[PDB]
Write a protein that binds this ligand. Structure first.
Ligand SMILES: COc1cc2c(cc1OC)[C@@H]1CC(=O)[C@@H](CC(C)C)CN1CC2
Length: 383
């Protein structure tokens, strides 16, 4: 049934973000409050840029041959990424494995969201199922850091990666049992061209909303006071703890608020999420140390869950209303906007760091978010 596809997408994004985020206890092994590292900048941005580039081709590919085959391709390349990643002694091998993992993340996310939207035609529980998928993303990024840390500090370096690989194999067994991509299943009608879809005001407004929210995240994580040379208290706790607040708030907000955002007015959800994101990003620089950095994360993650659960079903619904019922290209647009923030995070952050200080960057990012928030009013009554 439909819930089975929902579970497939849930666990696919769960394992995807688990593999994405389990790296954090391992990044220290390779070599005022907020500072950037050029070594982690390429590590943080190579996956994002590769996945950025790889998105629209996969959208067209799902439009061409079907949904399950790209998901199984995501299985194959994520498994080979884990295999080449556990043994990745060198930094170049690490970057190449991250790029392969990015291709896998692109196909998994785009195809899963597209088929989840296609099977769930009506918008009443469409928001619910996209909220559940994003909750799977949040749960994966929540369980990543501490699982990786305990497996690294109790067994060894390769043990978390091998255990995650076994979990991926169980996932792929489930995929083969469920989707069965035995034959190519072409779509009934040709989809709306990607270039024509970018000539749309509302789609671009939603894409900019998601891009600015994820940029609000992405300008902070590579610059967190983590993964230095050494620590007085040996650190090793912040590595597994620092992503608890944002992930917990994302999970809670998305899961509890998708249905109520459908009820109350989803443009209102977008606007409130943008306002709270701006407030949180603007109040990050007013923190003396990492002691006070925990509080604004609970707000920024909550509001970015708001934005994601309030714009991904709109990405589906705008094309459902004003275009043909083909979702691959529009969800490729949604995800390319979703990841452009992470892709341009390190370079833009470093340039603006060389120019001015970080607190001014946080204030200007919050100002842009606040000024862009009223533009979500245009989505109340789309023709
Ligand atoms: C290794 O660098 C990464 C670090 C982190 C993430 C992804 C990364 O890979 C680029 C995820 C992914 C997201 O989407 C964000 C979740 C927010 C919105 C709660 C941020 N988290 C947490 C930290």
């Amino acid at each position: 049934s439909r819930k089975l596809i929902l579970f497939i997408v849930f666990l696919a994004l769960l394992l995807d973000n688990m593999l994405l985020t389990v790296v954090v206890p391992i990044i220290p092994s390779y070599l005022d409050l907020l500072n950037e590292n050029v070594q982690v900048g390429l590590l943080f941005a190579s996956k994002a840029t590769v996945q950025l580039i790889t998105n629209p081709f996969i959208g067209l590919l799902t439009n061409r041959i079907g949904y399950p085959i790209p998901i199984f391709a995501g299985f194959c390349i994520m498994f080979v990424s884990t295999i080449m990643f556990a043994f990745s002694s060198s930094y170049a091998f690490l970057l190449i494995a991250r790029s392969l993992q990015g291709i896998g993340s692109s196909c998994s996310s785009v195809a899963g969201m597209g088929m989840l939207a296609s099977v769930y035609t009506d918008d009443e529980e469409r928001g619910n199922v996209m909220g559940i998928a994003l909750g799977g993303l949040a749960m994966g990024v929540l369980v990543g850091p501490p699982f990786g840390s305990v497996l690294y500090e109790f067994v060894g370096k390769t043990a978390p990666f091998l255990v995650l690989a076994a979990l991926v194999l169980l996932d792929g067994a489930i995929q083969l049992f469920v989707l069965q991509p035995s034959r190519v299943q072409p779509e009934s009608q040709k989809g709306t061209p990607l270039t024509t879809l970018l000539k749309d005001p509302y789609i671009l407004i939603a894409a900019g909303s998601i891009c600015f929210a994820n940029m609000g995240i992405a300008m902070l994580e590579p610059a967190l006071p983590i993964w230095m040379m050494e620590t007085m208290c040996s650190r090793k706790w912040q590595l597994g703890v620092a992503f608890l607040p944002a992930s917990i708030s994302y999970l809670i907000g998305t899961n509890i608020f998708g249905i109520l955002a459908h009820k109350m007015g989803r443009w209102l959800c977008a606007l409130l999420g943008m306002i709270i994101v701006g407030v949180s990003i603007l109040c990050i620089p007013f923190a003396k140390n990492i002691y006070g950095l925990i509080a604004p994360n609970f707000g920024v993650g909550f509001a970015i869950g708001m934005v994601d659960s309030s714009m991904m079903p709109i990405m589906g619904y705008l094309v459902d209303l004003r275009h043909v019922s083909v979702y691959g290209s529009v969800y490729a647009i949604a995800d390319v906007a979703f990841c452009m923030g992470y892709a341009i995070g390190p370079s833009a952050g470093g340039a603006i760091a060389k120019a001015i200080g970080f607190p001014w960057l946080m204030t200007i990012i919050g100002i842009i978010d606040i000024l862009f928030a009223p533009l979500c009013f245009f989505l109340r009554s789309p023709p």
